[PDB]
Amino acid sequence: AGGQWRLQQGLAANPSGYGPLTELPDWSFADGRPAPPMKGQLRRKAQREKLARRVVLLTQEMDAGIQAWKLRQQKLQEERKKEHD
Amino acid sequence: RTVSFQAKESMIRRLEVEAENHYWLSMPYMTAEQECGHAAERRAQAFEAIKAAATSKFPKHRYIADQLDHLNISKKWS
Amino acid sequence: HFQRQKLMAITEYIPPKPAINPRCLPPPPKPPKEESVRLLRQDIVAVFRDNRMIAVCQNVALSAEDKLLLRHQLRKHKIFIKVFPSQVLKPFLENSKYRNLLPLFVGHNLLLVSEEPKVKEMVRVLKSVPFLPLLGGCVDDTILSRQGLVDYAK
Amino acid sequence: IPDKVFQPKPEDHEKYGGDPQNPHKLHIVTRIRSTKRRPYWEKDTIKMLGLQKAHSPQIHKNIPSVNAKLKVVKHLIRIQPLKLPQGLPTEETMSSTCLKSTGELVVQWHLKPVE
RNA sequence: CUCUUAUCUUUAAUCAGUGAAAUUGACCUUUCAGUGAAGAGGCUGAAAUAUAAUAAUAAGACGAGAAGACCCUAUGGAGCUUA
RNA sequence: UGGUGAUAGCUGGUUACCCAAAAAUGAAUUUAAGUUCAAUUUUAAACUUGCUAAAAAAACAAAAUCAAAAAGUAAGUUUAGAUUAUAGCCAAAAGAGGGAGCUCUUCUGGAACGGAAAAAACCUUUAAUAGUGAAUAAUUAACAACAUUAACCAUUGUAGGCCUAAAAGCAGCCACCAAUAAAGAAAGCGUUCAAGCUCAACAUAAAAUCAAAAUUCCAUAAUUUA
RNA sequence: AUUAAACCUUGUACCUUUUGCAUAAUGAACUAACUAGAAAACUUCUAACUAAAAGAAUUACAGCUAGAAACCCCGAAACCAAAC
Numbered sequence: 001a002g003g004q005w006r007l008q009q010g011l012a013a014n015p016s017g018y019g020p021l022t023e024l025p026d027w028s029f030a031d032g033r034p035a036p037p038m039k040g041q042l043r044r045k046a047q048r049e050k051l052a053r054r055v056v057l058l059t060q061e062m063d064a065g066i067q068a069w070k071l072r073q074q075k076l077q078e079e080r081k082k083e084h085d
Numbered sequence: 086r087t088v089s090f091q092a093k094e095s096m097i098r099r100l101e102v103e104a105e106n107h108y109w110l111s112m113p114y115m116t117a118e119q120e121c122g123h124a125a126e127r128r129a130q131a132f133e134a135i136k137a138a139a140t141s142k143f144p145k146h147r148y149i150a151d152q153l154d155h156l157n158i159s160k161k162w163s
Numbered sequence: 164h165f166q167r168q169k170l171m172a173i174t175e176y177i178p179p180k181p182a183i184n185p186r187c188l189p190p191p192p193k194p195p196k197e198e199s200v201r202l203l204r205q206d207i208v209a210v211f212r213d214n215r216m217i218a219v220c221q222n223v224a225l226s227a228e229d230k231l232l233l234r235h236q237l238r239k240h241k242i243f244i245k246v247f248p249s250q251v252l253k254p255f256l257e258n259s260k261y262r263n264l265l266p267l268f269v270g271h272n273l274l275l276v277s278e279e280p281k282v283k284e285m286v287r288v289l290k291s292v293p294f295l296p297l298l299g300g301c302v303d304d305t306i307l308s309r310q311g312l313v314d315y316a317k
Numbered sequence: 318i319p320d321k322v323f324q325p326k327p328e329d330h331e332k333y334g335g336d337p338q339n340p341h342k343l344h345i346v347t348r349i350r351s352t353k354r355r356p357y358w359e360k361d362t363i364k365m366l367g368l369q370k371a372h373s374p375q376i377h378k379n380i381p382s383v384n385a386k387l388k389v390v391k392h393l394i395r396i397q398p399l400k401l402p403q404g405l406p407t408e409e410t411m412s413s414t415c416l417k418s419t420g421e422l423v424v425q426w427h428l429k430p431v432e
Numbered sequence: 433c434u435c436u437u438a439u440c441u442u443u444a445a446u447c448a449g450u451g452a453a454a455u456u457g458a459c460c461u462u463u464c465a466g467u468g469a470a471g472a473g474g475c476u477g478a479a480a481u482a483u484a485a486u487a488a489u490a491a492g493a494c495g496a497g498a499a500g501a502c503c504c505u506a507u508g509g510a511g512c513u514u515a
Numbered sequence: 516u517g518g519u520g521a522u523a524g525c526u527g528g529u530u531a532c533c534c535a536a537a538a539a540u541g542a543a544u545u546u547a548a549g550u551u552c553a554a555u556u557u558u559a560a561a562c563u564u565g566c567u568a569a570a571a572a573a574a575c576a577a578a579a580u581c582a583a584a585a586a587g588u589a590a591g592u593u594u595a596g597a598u599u600a601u602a603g604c605c606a607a608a609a610g611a612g613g614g615a616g617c618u619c620u621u622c623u624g625g626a627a628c629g630g631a632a633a634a635a636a637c638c639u640u641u642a643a644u645a646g647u648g649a650a651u652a653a654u655u656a657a658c659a660a661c662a663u664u665a666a667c668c669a670u671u672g673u674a675g676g677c678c679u680a681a682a683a684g685c686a687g688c689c690a691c692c693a694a695u696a697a698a699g700a701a702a703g704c705g706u707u708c709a710a711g712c713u714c715a716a717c718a719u720a721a722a723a724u725c726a727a728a729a730u731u732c733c734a735u736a737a738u739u740u741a
Numbered sequence: 742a743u744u745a746a747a748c749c750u751u752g753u754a755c756c757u758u759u760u761g762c763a764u765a766a767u768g769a770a771c772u773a774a775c776u777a778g779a780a781a782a783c784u785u786c787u788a789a790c791u792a793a794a795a796g797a798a799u800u801a802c803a804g805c806u807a808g809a810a811a812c813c814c815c816g817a818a819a820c821c822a823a824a825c
């Protein structure tokens with residue numbers, strides 16, 4: 001329940017999604033020493049980083065396709081303007 | 086079987102969501118010409134790895150250590 | 164299937180709601196009145212103009228043919244029973260020489276139209292049947308009662 | 318189905334908040350239904366697109382081939398345009414990226430409530 | 433038989449002695465309506481319901497049953513006989 | 516008794532665990548409970564494109580067949596060896612017999628531990644793990660009809676001509692006019708025939724596009740706090 | 742599950758067989774013992790030796806030798822011989 005309202009506020013519909021409750025460490029040493037990163041958090045980080053790399057690659061590939069498109073239209077333009085003799 | 090009010094709303098929501106899908110599919114960022122060959126290099130490289138992996142089958146090697154290690158089963162206190 | 168039945172309901176058209184129902188609407192303009200009935204105006208206008216004094220007596224369920232005979236009977240008296248439907252009688256005052264005789268011409272009653280001051284002839288008609296309510300004659304197109312008619316029929 | 322369905326109108330742009338110029342580059346698609354009891358062609362497309370797991374985020378290009386493929390499976394997916402308020406992530410920030418449900422991929426996560 | 437009744441013997445019931453057979457998935461073994469294949473003690477929905485016993489009757493569930501009964505067929509088999 | 520553990524394509528039974536892959540087309544058969552051939556699957560080897568998709572062009576008539584480049588993607592072709600499977604069920608489409616419904620042929624889908632009452636075949640559902648967490652999907656319930664028609668009166672010609680005894684508005688039969696304020700040469704009634712009952716006449720009322728069979732009823736109830 | 746044996750909640754006996762279904766149909770009083778897959782011609786695999794191999798008879802222009810790897814049970818009506 002409440003997923004619709006959470007989306008309205010910009011939060012994840014399920015509290016178990018992206019949030020401080022899930023992402024943040026759940027404990028720390030009494031001495032104050034920071035706790036080791038959670039295996040799930042590290043696992044989740046790897047997938048998020050991998051997806052980000054895919055986004056960069058796809059955007060870079062799309063950028064090349066956009067430029068290479070114009071480059072192909074520059075070859076036609078120069079081909080049209082030709083002379084001899 | 087008279088239709089419950091809840092069911093009608095759910096179907097309407099699905100249609101409305103599908104309508105949004107139509108709109109976001111109505112603006113192709115890249116034209117047909119640009120798409121051609123944009124991923125050609127990647128596809129060629131991927132298939133080469135597939136062929137190399139596919140044709141890598143062979144029987145496995147045999148080592149002396151396997152036969153010699155079996156003799157260790159007789160180890161005991163001195 | 165259940166899903167198919169849902170589609171049928173969806174096809175139902177959604178109509179908007181009018182602000183006010185026609186009965187409870189504020190008084191709107193209405194089509195202009197038209198005089199259809201127009202012919203009857205000339206007939207009553209001519210006879211009333213011709214005859215100054217119009218003796219009046221509520222018809223006692225008299226038959227149409229009797230009026231034809233009574234028309235001829237008054238022709239002996241030099242008077243005419245020229246009467247017409249009363250639905251177009253009320254608009255007579257609207258388009259005629261006078262406009263104030265509407266209350267006098269309330270109900271459907273015999274109209275005895277006479278142009279000549281032959282008092283004896285008019286009374287003799289009254290002598291035929293007195294029991295029917297005789298309102299009186301508008302001597303000189305003036306409102307008169309039954310007793311007033313006698314007071315001014317002279 | 319007539320092509321007019323996929324021809325947008327000015328009112329449609331306002332409703333969905335999509336600019337006819339500078340169209341969004343990447344589609345966000347998640348499977349929300351099962352392919353069981355569906356014809357083989359529908360099943361094949363879902364497997365090809367990689368949407369085997371429901372509610373699984375996928376990054377795809379807004380290109381005609383992808384657009385044609387997405388149209389076939391339109392009813393089983395939700396399409397959202399990706400947004401980059403801070404631009405593309407850098408190599409150093411690749412580990413700090415986070416995608417929000419609103420469709421915005423932040424390149425820096427500061428662990429502070431938006432409030 | 434109208435029109436049944438009475439008595440006696442056997443059986444019956446009680447005490448004591450001796451003591452089988454068919455049968456048997458397990459059963460803490462209900463009623464109504466539904467559902468189903470003609471079909472429900474065991475499912476669905478209602479209802480009823482101290483525990484344990486004791487004594488009686490055979491109408492129905494178009495009761496359960498067999499290789500019972502009758503007639504006819506086969507470009508079915510097989511066996512037998514030939515002129 | 517022996518041959519004899521006769522034979523039986525038939526009936527019945529046929530004893531530990533775990534991992535992987537996995538049944539239902541065409542041709543012939545005393546063949547349809549089986550077997551052979553193609554096809555599949557499968558093992559090994561050779562080495563490279565395959566599947567979805569696919570513009571335009573034809574072909575047909577005036578979304579599949581064919582398949583440039585792509586794109587999404589990872590299998591595919593050939594050679595050698597080899598079997599097993601080759602009988603559904605129901606739902607839903609398209610046809611053909613037909614006229615109900617059925618009888619078929621073709622395409623599509625299914626095998627909950629959720630839901631539709633119980634519910635192999637319908638709907639929501641990617642596998643299965645512990646936890647006294649969380650967001651969601653399908654989900655047997657649903658909320659009488661009217662926008663010309665309500666009061667009053669009914670005279671005279673001609674009982675008009677027609678075989679009708681007679682038929683006068685009103686048995687048949689006619690054409691189809693007048694006076695009148697208003698009378699139909701008659702609209703339903705009555706009819707020995709007519710007298711006669713009203714409707715229309717005139718006057719005077721007042722209005723304005725469909726809904727929500729025989730044992731014993733069978734949850735109980737319930738119209739308004741966002 | 743539970744403080745609590747019973748109450749509340751959930752759940753249509755088993756094998757075989759029918760359609761991958763039984764509210765069909767077969768079989769079962771229970772206990773103990775007994776009660777049903779058996780063969781190497783060729784292949785793959787493991788090794789010996791190699792234009793050779795095998796302790797005689799076999800095969801061979803990489804073959805040849807050895808080893809391992811396999812295919813149930815009970816039950817008719819009958820038919821025949823010899824005695825009684």
Ligand code: FES
Nearest residue numbers: 184185186187188
């Ligand atoms: S509220 Fe009824 S007529 Fe206005």
